[PDB]
Scaffold this motif. Sequence first.
Motif, PDB file in Angstrom:
ATOM      1  N   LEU B  36      50.619  38.175  40.362  1.00  0.00           N
ATOM      2  CA  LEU B  36      51.950  37.628  39.657  1.00  0.00           C
ATOM      3  C   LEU B  36      53.204  38.362  40.317  1.00  0.00           C
ATOM      4  O   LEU B  36      53.262  39.679  40.168  1.00  0.00           O
ATOM      5  CB  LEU B  36      52.103  37.678  38.260  1.00  0.00           C
ATOM      6  N   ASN B  37      54.214  37.672  40.602  1.00  0.00           N
ATOM      7  CA  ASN B  37      55.663  38.339  40.860  1.00  0.00           C
ATOM      8  C   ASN B  37      56.313  38.736  39.423  1.00  0.00           C
ATOM      9  O   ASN B  37      55.795  37.766  38.627  1.00  0.00           O
ATOM     10  CB  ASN B  37      56.430  37.553  41.835  1.00  0.00           C
ATOM     11  N   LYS B  38      57.292  39.374  39.371  1.00  0.00           N
ATOM     12  CA  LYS B  38      58.098  39.419  38.225  1.00  0.00           C
ATOM     13  C   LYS B  38      58.649  38.213  37.401  1.00  0.00           C
ATOM     14  O   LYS B  38      58.800  38.059  36.164  1.00  0.00           O
ATOM     15  CB  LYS B  38      59.218  40.463  38.486  1.00  0.00           C
ATOM     16  N   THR B  39      59.043  37.292  38.206  1.00  0.00           N
ATOM     17  CA  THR B  39      59.682  36.187  37.781  1.00  0.00           C
ATOM     18  C   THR B  39      58.493  35.172  36.959  1.00  0.00           C
ATOM     19  O   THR B  39      58.988  34.544  36.087  1.00  0.00           O
ATOM     20  CB  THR B  39      60.404  35.207  38.834  1.00  0.00           C
ATOM     21  N   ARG B  69      53.771  45.307  48.317  1.00  0.00           N
ATOM     22  CA  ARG B  69      54.805  44.423  49.015  1.00  0.00           C
ATOM     23  C   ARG B  69      54.241  43.473  49.732  1.00  0.00           C
ATOM     24  O   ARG B  69      52.912  43.472  50.158  1.00  0.00           O
ATOM     25  CB  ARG B  69      55.241  45.421  50.096  1.00  0.00           C
ATOM     26  N   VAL B  70      54.806  42.172  49.681  1.00  0.00           N
ATOM     27  CA  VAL B  70      54.451  40.916  50.079  1.00  0.00           C
ATOM     28  C   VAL B  70      55.564  40.194  50.429  1.00  0.00           C
ATOM     29  O   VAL B  70      56.575  39.944  49.480  1.00  0.00           O
ATOM     30  CB  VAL B  70      53.487  40.234  48.853  1.00  0.00           C
ATOM     31  N   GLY B  71      55.820  39.575  51.702  1.00  0.00           N
ATOM     32  CA  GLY B  71      57.065  39.162  51.993  1.00  0.00           C
ATOM     33  C   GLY B  71      58.112  40.369  51.855  1.00  0.00           C
ATOM     34  O   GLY B  71      57.708  41.350  52.424  1.00  0.00           O
ATOM     35  N   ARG B  72      59.224  40.191  51.563  1.00  0.00           N
ATOM     36  CA  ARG B  72      60.106  41.421  51.561  1.00  0.00           C
ATOM     37  C   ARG B  72      60.183  41.540  49.953  1.00  0.00           C
ATOM     38  O   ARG B  72      61.183  42.116  49.409  1.00  0.00           O
ATOM     39  CB  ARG B  72      61.590  41.208  52.007  1.00  0.00           C
ATOM     40  N   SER B  73      59.407  41.084  48.983  1.00  0.00           N
ATOM     41  CA  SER B  73      59.319  41.261  47.710  1.00  0.00           C
ATOM     42  C   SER B  73      57.801  41.876  47.331  1.00  0.00           C
ATOM     43  O   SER B  73      57.371  42.231  48.238  1.00  0.00           O
ATOM     44  CB  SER B  73      59.564  40.095  46.976  1.00  0.00           C
ATOM     45  N   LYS B  74      57.758  42.045  45.995  1.00  0.00           N
ATOM     46  CA  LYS B  74      56.526  42.708  45.396  1.00  0.00           C
ATOM     47  C   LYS B  74      55.625  41.765  44.642  1.00  0.00           C
ATOM     48  O   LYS B  74      56.178  41.060  43.965  1.00  0.00           O
ATOM     49  CB  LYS B  74      57.043  43.866  44.583  1.00  0.00           C
ATOM     50  N   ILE B  75      54.503  42.342  44.359  1.00  0.00           N
ATOM     51  CA  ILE B  75      53.517  41.596  43.541  1.00  0.00           C
ATOM     52  C   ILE B  75      52.748  42.541  42.474  1.00  0.00           C
ATOM     53  O   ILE B  75      52.395  43.678  43.220  1.00  0.00           O
ATOM     54  CB  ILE B  75      52.496  40.427  44.174  1.00  0.00           C
ATOM     55  N   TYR B  76      52.338  42.133  41.374  1.00  0.00           N
ATOM     56  CA  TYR B  76      51.775  42.975  40.709  1.00  0.00           C
ATOM     57  C   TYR B  76      50.298  42.475  40.031  1.00  0.00           C
ATOM     58  O   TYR B  76      49.955  41.115  40.090  1.00  0.00           O
ATOM     59  CB  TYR B  76      52.527  43.235  39.154  1.00  0.00           C
ATOM     60  N   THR B  77      49.444  43.363  40.105  1.00  0.00           N
ATOM     61  CA  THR B  77      48.045  42.926  39.751  1.00  0.00           C
ATOM     62  C   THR B  77      47.559  44.070  38.714  1.00  0.00           C
ATOM     63  O   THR B  77      48.118  45.249  38.689  1.00  0.00           O
ATOM     64  CB  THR B  77      47.018  43.041  40.865  1.00  0.00           C
ATOM     65  N   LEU B  78      46.618  44.096  37.755  1.00  0.00           N
ATOM     66  CA  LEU B  78      46.332  45.072  36.888  1.00  0.00           C
ATOM     67  C   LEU B  78      45.519  46.185  37.778  1.00  0.00           C
ATOM     68  O   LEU B  78      44.778  45.605  38.651  1.00  0.00           O
ATOM     69  CB  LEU B  78      45.223  44.554  35.945  1.00  0.00           C
ATOM     70  N   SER B  79      45.569  47.203  37.492  1.00  0.00           N
ATOM     71  CA  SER B  79      44.904  48.268  38.020  1.00  0.00           C
ATOM     72  C   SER B  79      43.427  48.108  37.376  1.00  0.00           C
ATOM     73  O   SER B  79      43.360  47.499  36.578  1.00  0.00           O
ATOM     74  CB  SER B  79      45.443  49.540  37.805  1.00  0.00           C
ATOM     75  N   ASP B  80      42.709  49.264  37.781  1.00  0.00           N
ATOM     76  CA  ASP B  80      41.178  49.458  36.903  1.00  0.00           C
ATOM     77  C   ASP B  80      41.429  49.879  35.781  1.00  0.00           C
ATOM     78  O   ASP B  80      40.840  49.484  34.737  1.00  0.00           O
ATOM     79  CB  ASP B  80      40.577  50.478  37.940  1.00  0.00           C
TER      80      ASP B  80
END
Lengths: 93, 93
Positions: B36-39, B69-80
């Motif tokens: 997911l992105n922040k938005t 980093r993905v495009g010039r933005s960021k994405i978030y995933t759960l870590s372990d």
Amino acid sequence: FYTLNIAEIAERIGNDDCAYQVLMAFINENGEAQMLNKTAVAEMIQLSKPTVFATVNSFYCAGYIDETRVGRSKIYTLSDLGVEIVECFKQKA
Amino acid sequence: FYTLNIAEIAERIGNDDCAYQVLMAFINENGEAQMLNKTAVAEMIQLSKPTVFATVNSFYCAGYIDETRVGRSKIYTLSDLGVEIVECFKQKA
């Protein structure tokens, strides 16, 4: 249950203005850790209450700051983990 | 450097609506962890951008979510670590 590298954490916090200032707010003029309510922190750093409060909340979740009931409100102090993170920064500077 | 009890963390998060929903947002309709992105997160849960974003930021600091980093933005995933925290909740429910 889970081992933690304190250097990575400090590295992450250092790349995020709000986290960094929320953390350092607890360190006083003489280098000593101090107690603060949520309002004190938001007043001390120049970011909005919502930002600062949410950061305070998450930092207590993370175990970086402690919460203790006082009156019918709460106060925050750095945990031992919090103090150790602050030490990495002091060493940089 | 530092050992972490995953039960206390989950206990803390469970007592904080925003942290909890920010965490669970990454778990999808079929129980699978997602990107997911922040938005997306702020749109998904009914809390303001400032609250949600600051929480996302701190959770990445804590090492609960990963940033890539993905495009010039960021994405978030759960870590372990993130996934392990989510597991404590699933077991409750």
